[PDB]
Design a protein around this ligand. Structure first.
Ligand code: NI
Ligand code: NI
Lengths: 183, 190
């Protein structure tokens, strides 16, 4: 039922590829990054580095700021609350949409994107992968792994040195000068 | 807003790779296979044939019979109702689990699997992919694409012809003569 893996002393994901498994609600590998809880149910180890499966949940007003991925495609499927997704296409045209549970957003590689959770404890199902493989361990590497359940009581704010080195390692480029005009 | 694609007259999936998009609840490309409605939000064309994203929903008691995928890994993430997932590992050990919303099941390649919807209008989020590519257009191939919304009124029955033509073009081998020994399903128990 419980396993030890390269990522956690205690996990419900098995260390060996090829093994079927089940995980109850909430019990994937957990990470905190600012106010968000990220929960990983499958990683690249489970899929020969083809895809992953994770949830992100957070408090009202939590922002994932503008960033892009050079070799990763990313799915946003809302399961709780309401999440406003901002996207810029390759040509520079911007759009925003308030996604409610069961709605879907797709962000192709090199498209700048950001989102804001607009309800308390909103939750997004994410899959993010591409030719480059998968990068779900980005969140615990920039932020921190967590054993506790539920939202971080205090936001985990990464040290500037982490921002300097970690994001490029996981195909994340933040775009701090980006401006949204989607109104 | 809408688009004409390789798969549908009217789709909310852009035909051109590299384009961001949004789709509201229910309005992905739809397919019927027996009693179930499959709704595709992203396919291989969107991800350089890396992964896909779809939902499967259906009536109480609906069963997807035993099958396996030789190169495809499959995710079950329950969003509505309750779904019992049966899996046989590579050793032959079988397990079953009732998955409720928020719960997760994973089926590695070459593992025989089946599931049963145990509430009306249960719903699964699925990803089905692997080193060989992505699996999603299987449902409308064995079954039929659909324009209406909601569960099929009557089960769409594939012609038996399709059941050993269509399977191979996709990565699915049916196991009609598979026996479950886990209980909670017909079969001889442990
Ligand atoms: Ni992103
Ligand atoms: Ni399957």
């Amino acid at each position: 039922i419980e396993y030890a893996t390269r990522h956690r002393a205690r996990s419900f994901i098995p260390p060996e590829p090829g093994k079927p498994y089940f995980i109850e609600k909430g019990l994937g590998d957990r990470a905190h990054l600012f106010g968000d809880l990220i929960t990983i149910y499958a990683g690249g180890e489970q899929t020969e580095n083809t895809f992953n499966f994770f949830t992100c949940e957070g408090p009202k007003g939590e922002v994932i700021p503008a960033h892009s991925h050079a070799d990763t495609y990313e799915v946003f499927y809302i399961t709780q609350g309401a999440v406003r997704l901002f996207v810029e296409d390759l040509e520079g045209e911007q759009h925003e949409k308030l996604l409610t549970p069961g709605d879907f957003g797709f962000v192709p590689k090199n498209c700048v994107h950001a989102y804001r959770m607009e309800r308390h404890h909103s939750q997004v199902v994410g899959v993010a992968a591409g030719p480059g493989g998968t990068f779900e361990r980005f969140f615990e590497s920039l932020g921190t792994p967590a054993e506790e359940l539920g939202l971080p009581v205090r936001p985990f704010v990464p040290e500037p040195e982490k921002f300097r080195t970690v994001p490029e390692q996981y195909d994340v480029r933040f775009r701090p000068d980006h401006q949204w005009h989607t109104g």
